[PDB]
């Protein structure tokens, strides 16, 4: 997967999905923009959303591509900055917004344009606060909770296109078309189903592995294959 | 091939600086009078037959008249 | 049964290669090359669905060929946007700026006393 025949299929896809910049508006007060269409993008079973903000130094109309928060609809108003009202699809920094509220398309560095929580059905909740240091705790999707920098922001709600793991894909084709609008990756051939020279696991009379399928973190390539650095193994009971 | 419906406008379209010639078909029922300029074939359809000499003389000065046969 | 032919050296059924019949003075069958079906305009508002009334629909390097009024209707914002959505904007711009003169007076009862 390191190049050529694999690289992601980008043509019918509809934009890269970000926040705004930051500027004097977001930084000393607030700005308002309107929503002009919710809109589907491929390689990403969740919807985007165009939003005409008006540029505040020339006559113009800027136009962005947020990650659409459920409950948004068209025509509606989006008011944002360091003051703006905490309701839904209204953006303002973690510094400001209270504990308990849910967020999406959250930032990690102050000003980086949103890197966390934009896949379908993902949050990044706010827990606690410490205003000498200017730091904040945020429970992310994997159980853990990042210390974060208190001036770094997130649109309010929960991400659109919710509940996609539900339905059984049935037919093998429905896979193909899922994985024909992403990258060369599918009908996946097992490692024991390769000769001596084509995968280390496969070879001989039966179709066994032979070697234990855990391996050192500190292997080289060609070998680091299987369960990597595996803390434990088996059917997971208890917790 | 543009039409002319009256009898007072055709003649002017023959007096033009650029009207190169006139021709005059007779086929039972009508007399199609036809004039060429620098674009089209400006016809005219005179259905009355003693209305077709009086005119036939009236055609404007140093031009090249024909009859079609 | 005159089974017939293309006249150009393009004999794939491609897009730019669409045809129709014609009978000649000759009495012969013969193809003729068609020209593209021009859509009617869709209106700026964004919200309205279909097509414009009052502008000659014609494939767009011909719009040079026509003469002004062929491509609009008499009316403020004519031939760009639709008249149902226009009548709304004269209302809306009227009522928003009225209500604006109100709040100025019924914020000004605070700082007159206070």
């Amino acid at each position: 997967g390191a190049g050529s025949v694999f690289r992601a299929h980008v043509k019918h896809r509809k934009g890269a999905a970000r926040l705004r910049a930051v500027d004097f508006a977001e930084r000393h007060g607030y700005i308002k923009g309107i929503v002009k269409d919710i809109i589907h993008d491929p390689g990403r079973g969740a919807p985007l959303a165009k939003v005409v903000f008006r540029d505040p130094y020339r006559f113009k109309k800027r136009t962005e591509l947020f990650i659409a928060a459920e409950g948004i609809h068209t025509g509606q108003f989006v008011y944002c900055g360091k003051k703006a009202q905490l309701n839904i699809g209204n953006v303002l920094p973690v510094g400001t917004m209270p504990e308990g509220t849910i967020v999406c398309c959250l930032e990690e560095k102050p000003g980086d344009r949103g890197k966390l929580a934009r896949a379908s059905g993902n949050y990044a909740t706010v827990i606690s606060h410490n205003p000498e240091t200017k730091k904040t705790r945020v429970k992310l999707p994997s159980g853990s909770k990042k210390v974060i920098s208190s001036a770094n922001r997130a649109v309010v709600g929960v991400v659109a296109g919710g509940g996609r793991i539900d339905k059984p894909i049935l037919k093998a084709g429905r896979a193909y078309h899922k994985y024909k609008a992403k990258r060369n990756c599918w009908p996946r051939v097992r490692g024991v189903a390769m000769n001596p020279v084509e995968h280390p696991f496969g070879g001989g009379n039966h179709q066994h592995i032979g070697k234990p399928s855990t391996i050192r973190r500190d292997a080289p390539a060609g070998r680091k294959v299987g369960l990597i650095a595996a803390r434990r193994t088996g059917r997971l009971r208890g917790t | 091939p543009r039409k002319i419906e009256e009898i007072k406008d055709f003649l002017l379209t023959a007096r033009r600086k650029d009207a190169k010639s006139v021709k005059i078909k007779k086929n039972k029922d009508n007399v199609k009078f036809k004039v060429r300029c620098s674009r089209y074939l400006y016809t005219l359809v005179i259905t009355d037959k003693e209305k077709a000499e009086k005119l036939k003389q009236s055609l404007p000065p140093g031009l090249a008249v024909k009859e079609l046969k | 049964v005159q089974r017939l032919t293309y006249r150009r050296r393009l004999s794939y059924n491609t897009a730019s290669n669409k045809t129709r019949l014609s009978r000649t003075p000759g009495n012969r069958i013969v193809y003729l090359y068609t020209k593209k079906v021009g859509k009617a305009p869709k209106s700026a508002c964004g919200v309205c669905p279909g097509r414009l009334r009052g502008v000659r629909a014609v494939r767009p390097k011909v719009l040079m060929r026509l003469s002004k009024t062929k491509k609009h209707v008499s009316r403020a914002y004519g031939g760009s946007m639709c008249a149902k959505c226009v009548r709304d904007r004269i209302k809306r711009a009227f009522l928003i700026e009225e209500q604006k003169i109100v709040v100025k007076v019924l914020k000004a009862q605070a700082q007159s006393q206070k």
């Binding site: 079973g45 919807p47 459920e70 609809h73 509940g163 539900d166 059984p168 | - | -």
Partner: protein, 91 residues
């Protein structure tokens, strides 16, 4: 005349895929294609158009709901949890 004794839309699959997936597909392949009342206008013509992206075909307004239904279930009380933290702060 009733035509099938237990297979909803999933007559369209016959014997294929096995019993308990055909049961599991029945609950999602009936809700996705339904219609809903547009709250804005009032009519009965919300309707999906792709994954989690819905459209009234009367007042041309467009919403972001859940992939297979029009509200996601704790986005119904995500609105009633953000509304209630508008009470805690304003005083």
């Amino acid at each position: 005349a009733k035509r099938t004794k237990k297979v909803g839309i999933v007559g369209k699959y016959g014997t294929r895929y096995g019993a308990s997936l055909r049961k599991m597909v029945k609950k999602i392949e009936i809700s996705q294609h339904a219609k809903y009342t547009c709250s804005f206008c009032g009519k009965t013509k919300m309707k999906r158009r792709a994954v989690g992206i819905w459209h009234c075909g009367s007042c041309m307004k467009t919403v972001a709901g859940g992939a297979w239904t029009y509200n996601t279930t704790s986005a119904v009380t995500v609105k009633s949890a953000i509304r209630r933290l508008k009470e805690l702060k304003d005083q």
